[PDB]
């Protein structure tokens, strides 16, 4: 029944294979949701940076103006 | 007979495992290429934005200097 | 014996599925670590960034304060 | 020899089990990584919330003073 | 026979470890989804709060400008 | 002979699997309890901080009103 | 002495009683704890329920801030009017 | 006789110590239970609070609306005065 | 005989679990009672807080009425 | 005899379960019923509050009457 | 004879035990229902939030109208 | 006498068995503690080349800001003498 034994072993391999298919699916999901997160991520941080830059510019401008006015009064 | 059906089943398992290997190699390629692309992409954008930040910082410095020189000639 | 040959084939197939399963695991783990790291790094940088910008704003105000004092004292 | 065959099967299973032990480690790792993320994340989220309150209060007091002066001087 | 009962014990053990691996895989999928959802939601709230404060600051600046316009007309 | 060695191997594998079952169930309850605790803690902190934001926002609403009344009685 | 030994015997009986008292405590530790896990389930449900509603109300607070601004406007459009 | 019996007494003393020590262990077990109970109590309290704590959360919008309505009413009154 | 005795032992185990079932029930009821009571007091306490907020607004427009006088 | 006794214990266990069924029912009622009172109960609370405001209004009216 | 009768009783005993087990399973189902009863209680809280408040609002409106009448008298 | 003492010893052994049960409970607590301990948040100190550059860059930006400020101050001084 050697052949049969071999067949049994093959079926054991089969179950394991199903499990690995599932694992692959999980990996795919990870890439998917992680790819979505990193896409949102990077972009949003960049946006923030832009905003901050704008803000600094504004700040500078404002204070310059203020000082000018101060000396205009002086 | 039944052993013939089991031989067909094992051939089916071999085919599915070959598909598993193809998808495994391809998906490794996806992770590796995507990870390298993401790292290079974030490096490019973020270093570019750092140089941009310093560039407009110096540009605002120069514009404060120019406005103050204009004030000197009032 | 044809049957025997097929048994051998099956064994080889099993082997292929097995060592590679280990490989897959490694890929995942390794891969995951990398991913994690990347994410973390990004996040860290962002936080360092924003907060730092806030501080910068505060110090701009501080510069006005010393400068303002100079304008008064003079 | 049947017994021996069974034993061989058992060893294959233990190897799988080997990978299963690795999976347990994986679980652990995952969990802890998540924990870390929440920790640092909740930490600087609370920190940023404190900055939210401080920034709002300080700047509202600032325009309090500015609008006070504006209505006084008109 | 002792060999047959060893075989039955081995089969029971392999079934048990297969159920165990199923449980670990499903639990990893579920809790990975939960963890990434929670982390994404919290960081999304953090970036939203940053935008909330930027919007509030600008809108109250517009508010003060509206007072300036009103006083300029009275 | 070798068969009793195989019996010892199977027994130690069963012992290791029982240890893995204990660790798996224990770590499962760590995930469950930790997830519930994290959700409860973030809910607590979030509700506390939103109540803080609204309450102190109203508080300097009242303080702005009080300062305006004080200016009226100048 | 003899009397003391008798007392010791009485004490032994008391320790038997003590042993009985332990077991009960162990029982308390089991099933009760499982029901504590059910209480935790309830808590979890509640958490799920508030992992968004609170945010809506935060947005609500932003709106409140704007309401405050409006009220302030009213207040300052009053002092000028005297 | 004598000395041997003294040794026996020593053994008895050891037993007494075990009874004492054991009792202390039991006390410790009790401590590890009361704390747990407290935690459970807290959880139940929390549930109630959530509904009612939750009620306070749901009192933060409606109330605001009501205030606004009152303001409107005041405005109407002003119109009546003018 | 022996087998039967073992079965009896199993029954005893079931009765221990049976006791546990009773315990579930009682736990539930107890919990419920306590919970309800405390809960009641709490949402009423908060009604009072809300009342204060509303009451203060009433005071704010009594003032308006005074201005109208 | 012994077997009869075993049967009896089994029966007892079943009975315990049924006692618990009743308990469960009670619990359900408690959960709903009392909470419904939190219904009725808070209606009463609202009423109390309302009364308070009415009283306040009356006071205001008195002040109006005293100019 | 008698002994045999006792054996029969024992089998009946076993049947009863089985029934007890069934009952236990049904009680577990009841527990599931109990777990979902909490959600029904939350629905009751939602109803409390959405009808009594409405009533209050209506009430307010009506009595505000009464105040208007009073104002007309005054 | 002797025999009675032997019986007492047996009782003590039973008590010790109860103590062992308590020890098992303690072990469970220890297992809970094992499901913890270890380290905390990981600290960056590797790869230095890229990560280091990033941090460095941030710092540089800050420094640049400061430099600008200094320059501005200098300008102010110049015109203060003007
Ligand atoms: C490579 C690029 C860099 C190169 C650089 C070269 C560029 C050239 C310059 C042209 C610029 C000139 C343009 C005109 C400039 C006028 C702008 C301006 O100036 O508007 C001012 C406001 C901030 O207002 P502000 O900066 O004045 O506010 C302060 C601060 O509160 C301080 O602390 C106060 O104190 C102080 O007043 P003080 O009491 O006197 O101290 C007050 O100044 O900025 C904004 O508009 C923010 C905009 C939000 C954008 C919205 C959405 C974007 C969000 C999108 C994200 C979606 C994301 C989710 C995804 C996930
Ligand atoms: C989260 C992230 C956070 C980031 C967000 C970004 C911020 C942007 C916001 C900015 C937006 C602009 C902000 C302006 C808004 C604003 O500001 O409007 C003010 C009003 C409250 O007005 P208010 O807050 O000023 O009222 C007080 C209070 O009465 C106090 O006690 C008073 O005292 C004090 O005056 P005081 O005498 O000086 O002390 C007065 O302030 O809010 C509202 O609009 C409530 C709206 C109701 C919504 C309606 C329906 C919704 C209801 C839907 C439910 C249907 C349900 C049934 C379902 C049943 C169950 C299924």
Author numbering:
A (entry chain H), B (entry chain I), C (entry chain G), D (entry chain E), E (entry chain D), F (entry chain F), ...: 162 to 235
G (entry chain B), H (entry chain A), L (entry chain C): 154 to 235
I (entry chain J): 160 to 228
J (entry chain K): 167 to 233
Please give sentences taken from the publication describing this entry.
An unexpected feature of the TMED9 oligomers is an intrinsic symmetry mismatch between the CC and TM domains. In the homo-dodecamer, the TM domain was formed by three tetramers, but the CC domain was formed by four trimers. In contrast to the symmetry of the TM domain, the CC domain formed obligate trimeric coiled coils, as was also predicted by MultiCoil. The experiment identified a number of PIPs, with PIP (36:2) containing two oleic acyl chains as the most prominent PIP species. PIP (36:2) fits well with the cryo-EM density at both the headgroup and the acyl chains. The location of the PIP molecules suggests that they may facilitate TM oligomerization. The PIP headgroup between the TM tetramers is within hydrogen bonding distance to the R223 and H224 side chains from two of the four subunits at the tetramer-tetramer interface; these interactions could further stabilize octameric, dodecameric, or higher-order TMED9 complexes. In addition, several hydrogen bonds may bridge the CC trimers to stabilize the oligomeric assemblies, such as those from E163, Q165, E173, Q177, K180, E181, N183, R186, R191, Q194, T195, Q201, R202, and W205. We have detected previously undescribed oligomeric forms of TMED9, including octameric, and dodecameric structures. These and, by extension, additional higher-order self-oligomerizing TMED9 structures, are stabilized by intrinsic symmetry mismatch between the TM and CC domains. Thus, not only can TMED9 oligomers recruit COPI but they may also exhibit enhanced interaction with COPI through increased avidity.
TMED9 is a member of the TMED family of cargo receptors that facilitate the bidirectional transport of membrane proteins at the endoplasmic reticulum (ER)–Golgi interface via anterograde COPII and retrograde COPI vesicles. In addition, all TMEDs share a conserved domain architecture with luminal Golgi-dynamics (GOLD) and coiled-coil (CC) domains and a single TM domain. Sorting signals for COPI (dilysine motif, KK) and COPII (diphenylalanine motif, FF) coatomer proteins are contained in the cytosolic tail of TMED9. Here, we report cryo–electron microscopy (cryo-EM) structures of full-length TMED9 in octameric and dodecameric forms.
